[PDB]
Amino acid sequence: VSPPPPIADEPLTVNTGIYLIECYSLDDKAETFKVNAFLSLSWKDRRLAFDPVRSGVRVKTYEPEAIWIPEIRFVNVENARDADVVDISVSPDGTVQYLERFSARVLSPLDFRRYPFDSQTLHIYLIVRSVDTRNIVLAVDLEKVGKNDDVFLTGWDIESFTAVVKPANFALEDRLESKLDYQLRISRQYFSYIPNIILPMLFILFISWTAFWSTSYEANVTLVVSTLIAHIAFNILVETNLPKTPYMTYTGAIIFMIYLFYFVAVIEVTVQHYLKVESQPARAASITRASRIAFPVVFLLANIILAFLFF
Amino acid sequence: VSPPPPIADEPLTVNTGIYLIECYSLDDKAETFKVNAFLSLSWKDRRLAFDPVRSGVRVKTYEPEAIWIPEIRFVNVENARDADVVDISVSPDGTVQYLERFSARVLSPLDFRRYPFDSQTLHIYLIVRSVDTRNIVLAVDLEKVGKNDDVFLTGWDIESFTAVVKPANFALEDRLESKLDYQLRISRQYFSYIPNIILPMLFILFISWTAFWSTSYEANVTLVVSTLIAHIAFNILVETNLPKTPYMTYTGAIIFMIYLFYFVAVIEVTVQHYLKVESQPARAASITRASRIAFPVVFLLANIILAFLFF
Amino acid sequence: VSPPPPIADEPLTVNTGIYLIECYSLDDKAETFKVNAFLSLSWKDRRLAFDPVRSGVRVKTYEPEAIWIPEIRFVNVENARDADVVDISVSPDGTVQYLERFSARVLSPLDFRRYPFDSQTLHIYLIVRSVDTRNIVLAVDLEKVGKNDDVFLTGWDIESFTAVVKPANFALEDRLESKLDYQLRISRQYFSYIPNIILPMLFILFISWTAFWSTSYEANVTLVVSTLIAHIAFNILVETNLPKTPYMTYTGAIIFMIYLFYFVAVIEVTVQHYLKVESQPARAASITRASRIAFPVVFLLANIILAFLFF
Amino acid sequence: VSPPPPIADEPLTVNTGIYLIECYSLDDKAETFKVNAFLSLSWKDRRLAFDPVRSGVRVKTYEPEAIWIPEIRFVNVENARDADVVDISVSPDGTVQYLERFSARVLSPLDFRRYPFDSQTLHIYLIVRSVDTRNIVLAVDLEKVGKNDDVFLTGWDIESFTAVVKPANFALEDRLESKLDYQLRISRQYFSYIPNIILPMLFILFISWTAFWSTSYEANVTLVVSTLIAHIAFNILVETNLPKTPYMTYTGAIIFMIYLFYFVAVIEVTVQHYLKVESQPARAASITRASRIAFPVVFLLANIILAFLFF
Amino acid sequence: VSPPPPIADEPLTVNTGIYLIECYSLDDKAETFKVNAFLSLSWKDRRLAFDPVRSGVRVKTYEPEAIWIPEIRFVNVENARDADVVDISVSPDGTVQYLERFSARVLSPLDFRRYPFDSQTLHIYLIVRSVDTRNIVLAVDLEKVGKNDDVFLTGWDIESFTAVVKPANFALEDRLESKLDYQLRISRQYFSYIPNIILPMLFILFISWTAFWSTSYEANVTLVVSTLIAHIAFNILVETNLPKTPYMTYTGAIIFMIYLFYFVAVIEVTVQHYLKVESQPARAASITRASRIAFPVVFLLANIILAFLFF
């Protein structure tokens, strides 16, 4: 019921820990992710200390209403964290060990520039409100911070679950207090995105490049334009995988460059035809012969420039 | 338990403030957006005033049930806001400082005409119901209205968070009262919409225009019609980004104009062929040669007209 | 707590009113729509009447549990409405003024035959269960039925919000009682549907009709078949706007007719080619020349027939 | 309160009835359907019998808590039904008449083989748990089973609402008891599925068959392959209507056969070309001339065979 | 009330059982599934034992509050299950028989590698928290574990509902306890996936292979490229069925191989044309003639390699 009284001006330290059981629903559209984990809280309350002789046992189990529990909340969540309390154990010195199982949709922005090689830092912000009697400060108990052997992260590599040990206070409210940040560093796995996205998109463009080894303007127009259609269609096919970003992404820049190369390939084919029809087939043949190397070289070069710009 | 009594006929002033922590799920289809913010309320209640010497402390903390709190509600929300109280502090003169954290889906119409340069005014309407003893009026505390330094609005520029200082009363109910409006002026960022939507859609049309530099009717039909298909496919590709509006938008007018240009390009190619087959190749060559300039010129001109009409 | 006793056998009249604040989620698939509105109830209870001098105030505010409130329910809703009470005010004569804010998904069938010119009648059925002590009858207070100046209905014209003043009793239950119907007559806005749906779909078909002014079978096959593809693609593009109806709609009949015209156009092109190859170019030329008028004429005629059949 | 005592060993008979008011959300994907209906329960309790002379009235109205009500539940629901009680009336002999309004998602498998002519049997399984004091058995009161005149079933014909009078006991639990089944036999309406799905899909294939009346290999390749594309596109267009079934459906078999016919048509066109180029234009002409009849004939036969196999 | 006291140090055994009534919402995207089942709990409480002679009846029915009930929770659920209790019966020896109906979204990872032949193990983890007075251990009662005769799993074969008899303790919390696992082994049905996905996808590729029996470079380019488009379109058509996996799946590898074969087929056609134009038609004819066998052989071989690698 009542908060524990402070022996001195020192604030009450609440040790926190999150044991990630499962992470489901990775909505790349809303930049939200659902989490199911264990939340552990540890704090010393002299009020519940006892002697083990007269009490008999070494541990005392209470119900959430029977004792005082700090109001711990999550900052970046869609709605209040659904709470299922598991156990409350008090040690002889009065140290309370709280454990609850929770599940909540977390708001965590994602940077899609480096996609599909991008690395992300998922954040889970813990916060506590200090009362008039008593101030409450949060701490991280590394022994209660962990991820299970059955942690499944399909498509990502879990780099580090290391929570922010020094989490700066958010000056939003009138009274500033330290909000314990939980940084989960992950890196995207890409073994599929090449054979499923990049490679076939390169194949269609290379097919368009066969117009440099032909003289029939009709066949060349069919090649370039029909391949352009195939490219659009393929983009429609993979649209789900690609991200709808208001900023420029690496992938998006490659796509744009491919569109430019289709335009230039059209220009080339048209010029070659015009020169042949205007009775100068020597120039037409020279341009086409040059394009056979120029296009792949310029493409590979611009890809190195792009890669350099983004990485 | 009871409303504060007025010393004179003057109404009770409730100072309001909203500190926007995070804005997620910006559904352009339903024209709704989810918000997570702090709501602060400030009002003077003489009933809770005290002397700080005999009471000892300078501030007095109460629970929501213990004291009277004005019934503040949001007008344009899908459903009732999340009700999580953070703190209630009473100063020696009796001034109550209320703070709560809420999360709610806000209903706010969006004008998509100027898209993708469109600017929007997001509205958050605050309202209070006046009691029999004393009427209650709302006010804006500019010191408690703010956005954090890390608030990032992906895809938008935040122009002004300036809430309506003079919010007209909504004559909806039987008793009219001032409803405090919160205008958030934002402007769309477009650094991506050109390379991802406009530019490739211009490329496909320009490809269709190469039929003016060819004489093979077969190749020209393939160029124009196949490019038309590529255009439809590309629209399907970007369909998600484009808005389903029941009124005419700037983008939609450009799209329609592109469809018209494909039709006219077909007409040209057909006429050229007919004149050649109908033994007048001088006219055919003159029309095609003219079209080489006419089409781009007329396009850029009509585009300037469109821009002028919408801006 | 207890129902007001009737002074005579007359039933208790509950005056109702619905103030539609916002209407979101217009599901064309389920024929359901979500509504957010104010519900006002007014009825006279002598038990709560008082004198304003000895009582001091002119209005008396109660809590929902403190007094009797009629059990008002909605018939055509997915589930029970959102129950958020706003205010309860009692006038000196005992007249109770109840106000609540609700949000619920309403079930209302939609007729898509006349689409996209279709007019609809949205229904909201109010119902009350009469108790043994005194029967309760519903009435409409036209002064409390209204829509705000900020009422947004994007794409529709609100014809009449006139609720059914004489709503017949539904003989479903064992005891029949009058259920207050709320008819919202609306008519679809089409300022976009011509330039966004009809016109480009007509353009593609007309492009297919250019095969009648050409003799090259290859170019004609490309024109007709490729335009047919463009037609399918365009339908996919506009798919969201068109309705998935199990009955035949006007738009759907037009679409089917367009498919038929593509088939016939194929037949024509094939016949013309066969006659030319089978050494009778006079007949081929006569058929093609006739088709140049026959196709548009028959189309416009059948279009007039369709319009007549549906309107 | 307590259950009514049996005069003899006979079980308590609870007469049931369901009045289907509206049926919304027909998810053919999840094979679930939402229902909103009235549930009526009737049973004789001597404990509540009275004389109408000393009591004055002929009917006695109670509240659900005041008297005993059997625990009736639904078997095939996603989650527990909506519980809104309408009326409880007791006759002088003690016969209780219970009426409640409910809304619940019913889980009911659908057989899509005969689609789009398929007939379905929707099931609603009622169940009651027998207590130690007296066993409870369910019965069907045909007078309380009905569907309103405003029952709307868009796209289906309601064959019979006849609930299972002899519903076999589910040996699921340890104690087997009869579970009252409610069979709703419906048949699909198809006046739209032919002009919207079948007919245009036949048109595209017939267009592919025009390659048998031409000798230009280029035009034939364009015809067959481009029509194949048009076929895929049309399937994408109607994809929503067609079902994603893990077993073989009639429609799915037709679709597969059409794909085979496109493959064979390709073979024919290629062979014809090869024979002509390999200086045997005689074989090519005989095969093509035969195919002109063979393809439609074989198609119609295989179509009758399919119909016979499925019906 | 209070937990039952142990006669000796042995822990309290709670026998569990889950009777799966219905399984809806099989989200292959989120790898979650919704379940509706009965949960039965059985445990002996000496405190409630009675003699059936003095009490009269053989069974005693209690309310959940009246007696002690173990706190059973699910590990891998989105949120706490729906809690609707059905019955609580106590036998004369004191053995309590608890039955509740629940509905909850279960988190279960799915392995899509072997798709569409893949087999899955759905997991439902039961857990109980031991109190200070007496430790509680869970057990599985197979007589209360079952699935109804009307259990519907459209598209899957239910192999075994056998729960983990020896479920290892999860060392997540501070105090390790055995968590009863419920393994539901299922295998995917594929009688449709061949005629609906594989077969037509093979048909289009085989159509591309007809370019090896033709010499017209124009027709071959049309064949290969247009079939490539048809392939992309078909993937778009079936996109819903295929899984968006971040790892390499068997199906995904087949798809990639098909894309490679389209690229190689393009190369072949181009080489053949180049050799013919460069005045060496003997080599061109030899390559084409070889490809006619090489392509199917290499395809079938690599397909056998893939099957072997995944199975």
Residue numbers in the entry:
A (entry chain E), B (entry chain D), C (entry chain C), D (entry chain B), E (entry chain A): 5 to 315
Reproduce text from the manuscript describing this model:
The GLIC is a pentameric 174 kDa (1585 amino acid) membrane protein, characterized by a large extracellular domain that surpasses in size the water channel diameter of most LCPs. The ultra-swollen mesophases were successfully used for the crystallization of a membrane protein, GLIC, with large ECDs otherwise inaccessible to the conventional in meso crystallization method.
GLIC was thus purified in a low-salt/low-detergent buffer that would not disrupt the swollen mesophase during protein reconstitution. Crystallization trials were then setup using three distinct lipidic systems containing 5, 8 and 10 wt% DSPG, yielding highly swollen Pn3m, Ia3d, and Ia3d/Lɑ phases prior to the addition of the crystallization buffer. Protein crystal growth was then consistently observed in all the tested systems and confirmed by means of cross-polarized microscopy, UV microscopy, and single-crystal diffraction, confirming the successful crystallization of GLIC using the in meso approach. Respectively, the crystallization from an initial double-gyroid symmetry (8 and 10 wt% DSPG) yielded crystals after ~7days, whereas crystallization from an initial double-diamond symmetry required slightly longer time (10 days) for crystallization to take place. Single-crystal diffraction experiments from the in meso protein crystals allowed us to resolve the structure of the pentameric membrane protein validating the use of the swollen cubic phases for membrane protein crystallization, thus opening previously unexplored pathways in protein structural biology. More importantly, in-depth structural analysis revealed that the in meso grown GLIC crystals crystallized in a completely different and unreported space group for this protein, exhibiting a tighter packing arrangement, with less solvent content (56.3% solvent content) compared to loose crystals grown via vapor diffusion techniques (typically 76.7% solvent content). Moreover, the structure obtained from in meso grown crystals shows the GLIC molecules to be in a closed state (see Structure solution and refinement in the Methods section and Supplementary Figure 3), in spite of the presence of H3O+ions at the crystallization pH of 4, which normally stabilize the open state of the channel, as found in the vast majority of reported GLIC structures. The crystals were found to be organized in a different space group compared to crystals of the same protein grown by vapor diffusion, with the noteworthy additional features of tighter packing of the protein and the stabilization of its closed state as opposed to the more conventional open state found in loose crystals obtained by vapor diffusion.
